Swiss-Prot record:
Gene3D superfamilies: Periplasmic binding protein-like II. The complex is composed of two ATP-binding proteins (MalK), two transmembrane proteins (MalG and MalF) and a solute-binding protein (MalE). Keywords: Periplasm, Signal, Sugar transport, Transport. It comes from Escherichia coli O157:H7. This is Maltose/maltodextrin-binding periplasmic protein. NCBIfam families: PRK09474.1. It is found in: Periplasm. Part of the ABC transporter complex MalEFGK involved in maltose/maltodextrin import. Binds maltose and higher maltodextrins.
Length: 366
């Protein structure tokens, strides 16, 4: 099964696995324990198959949303950091790793959508959604549009739909979803109106929105940190800020937390805890991973205050703190399917905000 006296770590190849490997050697030279870092493909799929037979890595890195399912099968060890350490990280990053009331992973990085704007076309971006319809009319007078973002994926529209009262699964509880409540309806209605008044096209997807923004056709777009590299090479003078409010309340973008779990079958749990708590989750450890490939916003308060010197990271973290934690539970799949259909049928008059959303509520509660 899992070897004793060492650490095998799994993380995705699109991360700073080389940087994490450096943090490992730093551990080796300090204990004599070899830390092997691997980045298998479909690792999010291989874990539940190797761990089930008592095998696999000691530590697995991945987005928090898949961890609920791992802990459901008892593949994850309940971690136990003391109050002192828990305080070194942002409180909300911890709610992302709580399952059935217990902590099942350490939060590493934070991710969330932000409002991106062309500083040349829009010196002062709108603080609210309600002021966007008007703004678009002004920009139309010059041949430019106000906003353009992916409308096909609920992941991009959820921020608005949930701004006022809207929410996925109630914190923990699965029989309590806020998809067809008054808030979600108000938000989706405002979204559909923008499409009806021609302020936005119902066929706008990711590629179209990105092209429009980079070619300088539209003033704003909603995207994540993974999109910045594209805009940089576009030269366009852009900025990243907090998302607009809707009816006085903040937009609720889903939050993704890159988490580090400990294999339940691992005989090196104490070592894993040592590595993660005193070697990785430190300003030096994270700065070694971030240098390889940026993590975005981090859960470690001390280091995050250092990364926030970037606008873009600071905006990411602000939007996240106000966001909603992606459904950690396994019932997540239904939600995405249900909401996606609703927004689409709602946008193309196939159904009304009431019908669409109501059908989505049942589909998820079943």
């Amino acid at each position: 099964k899992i070897e004793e006296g060492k650490l095998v770590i799994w993380i995705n190849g699109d991360k700073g696995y080389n940087g994490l490997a450096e943090v490992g050697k730093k551990f080796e030279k300090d204990t004599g324990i070899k830390v092997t870092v691997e980045h298998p493909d479909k690792l999010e799929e291989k874990f539940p198959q190797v761990a089930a037979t008592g095998d696999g890595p000691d530590i697995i890195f991945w987005a928090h949303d898949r961890f609920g399912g791992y802990a459901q099968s008892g593949l994850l060890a309940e971690i136990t950091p003391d109050k002192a350490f828990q305080d070194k990280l942002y409180p909300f990053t911890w709610d992302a790793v709580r399952y059935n009331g217990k902590l099942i992973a350490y939060p590493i990085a934070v991710e969330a959508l932000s409002l991106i704007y062309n500083k040349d076309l829009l010196p002062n971006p709108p603080k609210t959604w309600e002021e966007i319809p008007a703004l678009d009319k002004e920009l139309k007078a010059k041949g430019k549009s106000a906003l353009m973002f992916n409308l096909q994926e609920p992941y991009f529209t959820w921020p608005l739909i949930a701004a006022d009262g809207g929410y996925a699964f109630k914190y923990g509880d699965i029989k309590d979803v806020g998809v067809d409540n008054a808030g979600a309806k108000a938000g989706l209605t405002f979204l559909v109106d923008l499409i009806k008044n021609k302020h936005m096209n119902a066929d706008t997807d990711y590629s179209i929105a990105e092209a429009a923004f980079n070619k300088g056709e539209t003033a704003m777009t909603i995207n994540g940190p993974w999109a910045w590299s594209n805009i940089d090479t576009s030269k366009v003078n852009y900025g990243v800020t907090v998302l607009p409010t809707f009816k006085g309340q903040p937009s609720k973008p889903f939050v993704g937390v890159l988490s580090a779990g400990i294999n339940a079958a691992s005989p090196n749990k104490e070592l894993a805890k040592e590595f993660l708590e005193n070697y990785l989750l430190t300003d030096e450890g994270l700065e070694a991973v971030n240098k390889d490939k940026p993590l975005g916003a981090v859960a470690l308060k001390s280091y995050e205050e250092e990364l926030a010197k970037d606008p873009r990271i600071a905006a990411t973290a602000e939007n996240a703190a106000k966001g909603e934690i992606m459904p950690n539970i396994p019932q997540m799949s239904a939600f995405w399917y249900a909401v996606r259909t609703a927004v689409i049928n709602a946008a193309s008059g196939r159904q009304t905000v009431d019908e669409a959303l109501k059908d989505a509520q049942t589909r998820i509660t079943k």
